[PDB]
Amino acid sequence: SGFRKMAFPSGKVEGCMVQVTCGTTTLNGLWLDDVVYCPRHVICTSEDMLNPNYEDLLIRKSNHNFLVQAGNVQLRVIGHSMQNCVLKLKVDTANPKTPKYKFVRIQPGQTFSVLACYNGSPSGVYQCAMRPNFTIKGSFLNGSCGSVGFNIDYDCVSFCYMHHMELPTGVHAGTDLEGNFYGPFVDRQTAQAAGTDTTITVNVLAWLYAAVINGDRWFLNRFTTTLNDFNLVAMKYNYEPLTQDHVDILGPLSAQTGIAVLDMCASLKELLQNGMNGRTILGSALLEDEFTPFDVVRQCSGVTFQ
Amino acid sequence: SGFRKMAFPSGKVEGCMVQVTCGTTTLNGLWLDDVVYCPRHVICTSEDMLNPNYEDLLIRKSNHNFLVQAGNVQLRVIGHSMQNCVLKLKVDTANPKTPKYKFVRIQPGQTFSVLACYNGSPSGVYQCAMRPNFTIKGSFLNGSCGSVGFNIDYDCVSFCYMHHMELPTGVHAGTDLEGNFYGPFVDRQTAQAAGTDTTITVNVLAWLYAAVINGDRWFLNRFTTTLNDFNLVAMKYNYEPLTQDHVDILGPLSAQTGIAVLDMCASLKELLQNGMNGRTILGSALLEDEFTPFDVVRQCSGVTFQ
Ligand SMILES: [K+]
Ligand SMILES: [K+]
Structure with a gap:
């Protein structure tokens, strides 16, 4: 009968992916109801990234600083807030394709499907494990950030991962959808060692x-x-x-x-x-x-x- | 960085999967426009499978012998025909989620994504290669038949594989969407050796x-x-x-x-x-x-x- 690295069907997540732009950065966002979730480092310039004060960088931002595109449709940002390391952009439109979903923090060992995206558009899907050192060995390129990991139980998408960064070793790190990093990582361009795996x-x-x-x-x-x-x-x-x-x-x-x-x-x-x-x-x-x-x-x- | 067995996003194919039942046999069908494609062996009983005359078995079938369910919606079969080893059931409803698609016959060595389904519902997605001996090393169980392989180019789903059978060695065989087997295989329960892989x-x-x-x-x-x-x-x-x-x-x-x-x-x-x-x-x-x-x-x- 056989045995393969088998991902969940991606359809439910595909319809939630949007493109989010701020300053010099474009990455992906997750559009659920009238909120778009994305990594907060989207608000940083190169120089900000070295030592960002996010509370202060965000105060200096306005709704008009954020361009969210769902397909060829601009979503208007009408509010913005920060939960840990995740940016929440309130938009003028609830996603009509919002699935049943929850946000879950997984444990090391546990697996999930990744919908790798660039420019709000899905590139492919693959299965991943949260390594014991809280990294994942993904396949991600420049612009992949905001891509999510998920499991499905019945009709309910459990979002467990959002991609934030690639470490120098070529492994990946990110948060739950409440913005808390898995592992001892921070969204700052400063040397940070993965534990031994x-x-x-x-x-x-x-x-x-x-x-x-x-x-x-x-x-x-x-x-x-x-x-x-x-x-x-x-x-x-x-x-x-x-x-x-x-x-x-x-x-x-x-x-x-x-x-x-x-x-x-x-x-x-x-x-x-x-x-x-x-x-x-x-x-x-x-x-x-x-x-x-x-x-x-x-x-x-x-x-x-x- | 990183490199994974990466499948295409399955969303476009998910909305085409239906359940097809005939006699006591339930397997999957592909619902495109107002046609459902599925393996013709669905019309066989265990005893028929040993030496089926399909032309004759199909003559003795009526539209009402086929139950097609799309989600919790019954599709009424209003016509049936056979193209090689694929059954085409004309239904009363065009699939509103029919994607842009083509039917393509692939060559050995080429790869494709598989949406494994049971009872018209997707279980998972994975990447596959057409082996040189025209088998695929899939992950499929009882009821998987009618599951399809596909590639995506832009917005166009190229369907290249429909699952028909597991050989004794645990590898899998099937047709293009025109019903022609890849390899020297027949939809009959008679010994068939895969060539050396x-x-x-x-x-x-x-x-x-x-x-x-x-x-x-x-x-x-x-x-x-x-x-x-x-x-x-x-x-x-x-x-x-x-x-x-x-x-x-x-x-x-x-x-x-x-x-x-x-x-x-x-x-x-x-x-x-x-x-x-x-x-x-x-x-x-x-x-x-x-x-x-x-x-x-x-x-x-x-x-x-x-
Ligand atoms: K930026
Ligand atoms: K060499």
Whole structure:
């Protein structure tokens, strides 16, 4: 049946993307009801970016400083405010294509779909994980800022990411839709180090379950382990600790397959210690960690969105 | 920066997906204007599937044998015809969300986005390649049939694939939207072997260029090669021949990077012979072959879709 990096359908988000311009900067905004959300660094000039006082930069701004274009339609800005690192432009028109939505702060490990946009227009869609160091390994270019990450549950878009910057290492950083950065990052052009990145253990386990559902059973072994003994081995290979909450979320998959989580953990332990011996799991020679337990179920069970 | 399996935005295709039921079988249909396209095997019972006479099975069908549901709206079937292996159901309502579209027959190695659907509702979107043996390595479950593959150019959806079946090996086969199978496959439950699958060489090269654009240069070596000497090594590793046309299509990327195609070929030759020495290219320990030269440009240049 197969297994792919599978993104949510993008239709609901496509109709919310607009172009926002201020000064010398154009980037993307999210148009929901009569508000457009975008990164507040759009108000900065190059020189402002080095040490911006945003409260003061925004006071000196007027509604007429902001050009918002939805397709070939100018939206008139009739108000502006700042929530943390997000700019909220109140416009004269509610988006008639506003979907059901919420703003959610995700945790490291968790995944989301990215609708990469330039000039308010979608370029493509791909699946991403919030890395344990609060960066994402996206595919983004100049002008991508304001592009959002999202999950869909039924008909409800949960927006969890807005793109703000690329770090020097070529990885990406941003906020929830309430404007709070994931990670120790600030929207200021000043050197800022990403933490060291670790592997998302719960996701590697989820993917091993995916492999079992798709037939691959060679890595299942006769050994077992305790959670603590597993985490001790994990730590040494730069894997995130496995928590009881992780074990619980892997429940549905353990039930579906009949293999218990601690059994799978022992299977992973061996994989970490010995390697794969030039074998592949779901076409991969590396252990893949950008699929959550929910992602595997959704794909392996055929969950749909309406 | 960054490089991902990036799918086209799915919005334009989402609004064309419907549920088609006949007998006890439910699968997906593509609703364009007042026609719904779906696999004709929807008219077969399990017993019919072993040796179907489609002309005769269809004569014995009436419009009222087909239930089409678009969301919670029943579309009334008022006509039916068969074009090769695709069923065309004429319905009472033109799709108000019909996009600009064409039907295109793609070639092996070319890529496309898949909107996996169940019960006329989208589950997810992912990027696919037409394998050299005319199969696709999709992620599809029971009820996925009628799901389509597509590219977008500007505002125009080019439909290139409709899903019909999974082979025993777990790979997938289907038709263009005129109903002609890609490959030597038939919509009959009778043993059908996929040809031996080879690696899409031009795509591996395109991806190596992507890797260079993103920094990775460790695999660039001091050697060069002729096209023929390359193809001799390629053949031995189950790689498709590299043609002059392939060399020409890689031109833009060779220009962008400054590395000539035959130089990159030599870099690949060594990778094939020695392996990767536990190193990775764009996060991968395997050579990836599901990105075309165009795909790399689009993603690395930031092409957008109206
Ligand atoms: K600016
Ligand atoms: K070389």
